[PDB]
A paper describes a structure:
The large-conductance calcium- and voltage-activated K+ channel (BK) plays a fundamental role in establishing negative feedback loops to control the firing patterns of neurons, transmitter release, insulin secretion, and smooth muscle contraction. Additionally, two homologous regulators of the conductance of K+ domains (RCK) in each subunit (RCK1 and RCK2) assemble as a tetrameric gating ring (4× CTD) and serve as the cytoplasmic Ca2+ sensor.
Alanine substitution at hF315 (aF304) generates stable closed channels, even at saturating Ca2+ concentrations. To test the idea that hydrophobic interactions affect coupling, we solved the structure of the mutant F304A in a Ca2+-bound condition. The gating ring exhibits an expansion of approximately 49 Å, slightly narrower than the expansion observed for R1Q-apo and R3Q Ca2+-bound (52 Å). In the F304A Ca2+-bound structure, I308 interacts with I301 from the neighboring monomer, but this interaction does not lead to the tilting of S6. Finally, overlaying the adjacent α-monomers of open R1Q-apo with F304A Ca2+-bound resulted in clashes between residues of the inner cavity, suggesting that the S6 helix of F304A Ca2+-bound has a structure like that of the closed R3Q-apo. Changes in volume at position 304 impair the transition of the S6 helix, even when the gating ring is expanded.
Author numbering:
A (entry chain A): 14 to 44, 79 to 426
B (entry chain B): 214 to 561, 567 to 621
Amino acid sequence: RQWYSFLASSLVTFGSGLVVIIIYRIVLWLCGWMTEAKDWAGELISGQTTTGRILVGLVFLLSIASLIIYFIDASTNTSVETCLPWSSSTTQQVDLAFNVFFMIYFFIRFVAANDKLWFWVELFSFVDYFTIPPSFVAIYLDRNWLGLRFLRALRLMSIPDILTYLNVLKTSTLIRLVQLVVSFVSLWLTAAGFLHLLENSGDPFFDFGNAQHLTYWECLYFLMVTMSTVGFGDIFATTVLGRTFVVIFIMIFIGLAASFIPEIAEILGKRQKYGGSYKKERGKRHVVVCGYITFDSVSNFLKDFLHKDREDVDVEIVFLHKGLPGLELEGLLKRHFTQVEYFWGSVMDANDLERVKIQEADACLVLANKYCQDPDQED
Amino acid sequence: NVLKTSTLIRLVQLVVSFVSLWLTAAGFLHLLENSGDPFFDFGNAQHLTYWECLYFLMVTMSTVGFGDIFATTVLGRTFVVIFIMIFIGLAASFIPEIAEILGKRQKYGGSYKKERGKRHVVVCGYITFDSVSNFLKDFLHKDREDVDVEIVFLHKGLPGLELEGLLKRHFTQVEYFWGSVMDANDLERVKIQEADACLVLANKYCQDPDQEDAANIMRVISIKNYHSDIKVIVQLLQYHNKAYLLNIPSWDWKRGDDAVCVAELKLGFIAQSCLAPGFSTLMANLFTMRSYKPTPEMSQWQTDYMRGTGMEMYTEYLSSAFNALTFPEAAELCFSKLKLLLLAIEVRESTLAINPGPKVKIENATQGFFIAESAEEVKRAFYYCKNCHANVSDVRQIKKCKC
Ligand SMILES: [Ca+2]
């Protein structure tokens, strides 16, 4: 019966503030509470100042704390709605303590985003519009509803902002990945919450009689087997709204087959295989070999350098080259791995010269591409 | 003729030819299952809704195939087998190609909004993470005066991830817009008439310096063509091209326009170093903002050098206490009491005098040129109230006196 009281509280919050913004714009169009506040809120929400930095990291951490309470709510009980006396459960109190802090942070933003129609419609404002009012209805009404509280899982997309404002993610590929991962974990968790709501509520067209009691975890599973286009149908949608949402969701997540899983596999595969350093034993000598390194040049070199007719000296050979070895060269290096090493790098870089311990090296050999396009450039 | 753009007609053609065919096939499958098969006197039949057929066709087009709904007439089935062979073929174009077209939009469209109190400068030409970071690091440096100028980038390309990160870190006083100073609409987007100055940066590592100069001369032409009175500061990679600019009918050196020529300056500095070895490293350090940062793990000579690199050139009005001093005793007074080195003065028409002799005396509101660790240091030469207040040796004490 009573559920619409929660959702209506969200809608009147959105609508009343929107109408206030419109009549304010219209009154101006007929016709420190100054730009200092806009700038002050700006830096805060941007981590210029240390206090801004603390506040923004703490908004991010409390967003996770509220999301975890939604997982505890979705894991426990059975129904999407129950008439719990408001004071009784500790989890419901401490979620309200996070909820008021998000409401405070909102206004702050409002100030930085300068009391504007476009701001009042930005995604994270809706996340709040739909979370803050229902938790306040739950103070007045001795009842609990899971009621779109999953939307907090969108605020987890602050991670790339937090890690770039605090500036720990240095590399372009690392920011990209983390942006891909977090924008995939959000949306996946978010859609599982929305499907869980639609199936467990049942359809309004059928007086909520047509309903299906999924857990949130079964919705996560169901969305992964449909995102991957496997589709076992052991779990499947049965409300008409649910179904719909699945039809819409498929059209979105076939579109998100551009980037995501293939592009993260690309970036995560582009790492450097032959990083790291040589370790010099006291007894062994070594020589560093660089310049033109290839399977034919290395095999012609090794075949003479380690030949059986040569004296029984125990020199290790350390290759240093600015590229990944080919399969046949990795095979050759594997066959000689007892006295041969290869490292990615260049003798043009003093860090790579330290990696190969060039000071302790007995000699350094520079090989040439005898079949180059211009002998003078190779020299 | 409402759909102007080639990409818009293409998309709308893709969308509508996907909504048709999908709706159409749902109707045909709905007919075949709900009629039943004619081979079996219509006894073999399955009562789907049209909406269940739409759903069933979407989960088979996407190749998900739950099989919660599935075809059971032999005609239905057939039609599903044919339909799969069609809609695997329509995986060429459709969903990936509409996602491409819908993704090709412009991220950094739109316009700057000018507040009355704030100044801004427009920056264009060679814009990249390294050039922008080298520019921002000096332009917003802590040792610089507490001016509140906003920086508006205008460039004909999408910023790289590291540049979007840099722009995000400075978003309180930095903006970026897609466009070119060759287009009068983009000059309006950035409100160039209200801009305090425009800076044109150069690709110093280009394939041909003369083509990079030709491109920058155009820009300067295009900016001045839009509004004459904009102060334009332009980077040139060859002196032989500077002339061209001098002819543009509105380059007015007296107004502020300037052309930093990296050739003229480079070779110049090096020349001075022939007459006084080392100078070029004196001056180059003097014209870049840098705070001193002592550390462990650094030699005595490096700490002395580093302290020196901390100093930069600044300019400030001399206080009333300097009135009628000769320049040499004013400079002595700055070094001894203020802990500032005074090189030169603006002499009132306007001219600049370097180390002028005893013949020259400080007039009221004379602007001096100083070497100091920061703008906060040089303000002592403005607040200094003579023997009325300033008689205590911790220079830090100097602050704005009562009269
Ligand atoms: Ca300094």
